[model samples]
Target: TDAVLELPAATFDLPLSLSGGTQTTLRAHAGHWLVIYFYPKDSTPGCTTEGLDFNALLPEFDKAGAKILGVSRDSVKSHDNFCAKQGFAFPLVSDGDEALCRAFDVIKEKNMYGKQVLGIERSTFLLSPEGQVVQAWRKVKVAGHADAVLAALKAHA
Candidate 1:
C-alpha cells in the first residue's frame, strides 16, 4: 500500500484491452484524466454492481473530463460479454497475467468462506491529465464510489 502511495506524481503505463478487439495503453490516454479501477471478477455480485454504477455515471465522468477503465483478471471475452450485457460505455481492461494487478498492488490474500483466497482488493486510481496518479482508493466500497470520484475530480479542477 505504501508503494501505491508513492505512485502519485509518478507516471505509469499498462497495456489495456478494450471491447471489439481493440488494444490501448495508459500512455495513450495521456492528456485526459483517467480512472483505473480494479475489481475481482466479471459478472459477480459486487463487481456487477460497481460496473453498473460506473456505467450509469459515465456521462458525468465525461463531463468532468475523466475516462473510466475497469481492470480485472478476467479474459477479454469475459470483458466483452460483461460490458455488452450491462451496456457499459467505458472499456474494461483484461489483466489475464496479473500484470496490471501487480502494478497497482491490488492483489491481496483474503478469507473467502473460511479459506484463504487471493484476489483483487477493489481499488481505484485517479490519474491527472499528464498521467500522474493524483488520488487512489483501496478497499473501495461500491456504494457512492463513482460519486466520490466525481467529487474529487471536480474539487481538483
Candidate 2:
C-alpha cells in the first residue's frame, strides 16, 4: 500500500526526533513542501546514505520552504542515536507502533510459520503547502533519489 496523490496526509502526531534533542509531529510542518521518507531501519548503511543525501540538500530545501523527515519503526532512542551520529539537521520520525506507517501504507508484512513479520518498504511522499500529497515514490532506490525530489520541488515551487 502507498499514498495517493492529491489526497490529504494523515493528521496523526507521528513522533519525531531531531539532531538537537528536540521533537515534533506532522502538523508542525504545515504550509511548506514536505519530503517524508520511509526506510527499513535506523543506522543501516542504505538508510544512512539516504539520510545524508537528504541532509546534503537541506539548505536548498529550506530555501524552497520544504522540510525533510525520515520515518521508520525504529524506537525514539534509536532515532536519537542515528540522528546524532549522522549529524542530520532535519528530524527523523519514530514510528515504533507503525501507526503512521499504516496511514501512509508503507508497511510490508511477510508470513513465516503463520506469523506475520513487518518491515518498511522504502517510500517517499512529497506534499504540497496545504499538506496534500502531490507525488509519491514507492520502494525508493537510494541512488539519485534525493536529486529527483529536488527537481520536483523546484518545479512545484
Candidate 3:
C-alpha cells in the first residue's frame, strides 16, 4: 500500500538470475502479469510457508499468465539451499545489497521486541501487463496471503 505509492516502477538494466541460472526481469511487457513478493529471510518458518504456498499454486499462476518472483536479503547460496530443501520450482532473487528492496521501497524500519531495526518488510506487488503496479500488499501476513494475491490478480485480469 504505502510502499507502492512511494516508489516508482523501475525498468531493468542488469538481468537478474536465480541460482539455477534462469534470467528474469521485472519489466514484463503488455499482456503479461507478474507477482513479485518480498520476504524477510530465507528458510524461516513464515518464509517457507509463503514459498510453499506459491509453489503449490504455481500452475494456476502460469495458467493466468503470471510469473512469480520472490525477493529476499539472503545470499544466492542460501536461496539455492532453501529452494532445494523446500522443492520450490520458482525463482528467488538474491537482493543481498537490498537495492531492489529499496527500489520497491520494501526496506523500512521495523520494530522487534521494542527495538528498532532496519529490514525488509514482507510485501507483495501485482504488476500489470504494462509493468505498472496494480495492487500491493505490505506487512503481509503469511497465512492465506498468496490466496489473497491470486484473487486480486484474477480480479485485475
Identify the candidate with maximal lDDT.
1
lDDT of 3: 0.83
lDDT against the true structure, per candidate, is 0.83, 0.81, 0.83
Pairs that collide in candidate 1 are: none
Residue 123 lDDT (model 2): 94
Give lDDT tens digits, candidate 1, residues 46-137.
Answer: 99999999898888898878899999988999999998999999999888888777777789998879999988899998877876667889
- Report the C-alpha lDDT of model 3 over 1-157, residue by residue, as the tens digit: 4124444445444356575756566663356988889999999899999999999999889889888889997888898899999999888998878877887788898678889989989999987786677688999999999999998888888
Better of 1 and 2 by lDDT: 1
How close to the true structure is residue 11 of candidate 3, measured as C-alpha lDDT? Answer: 41
- Better structure of 1 and 2 per TM-score: 1
* Model 2 CA lDDT for position 52: 96
Clashes of 2: 0
State in Å the error of residue 66, model 1.
1.1
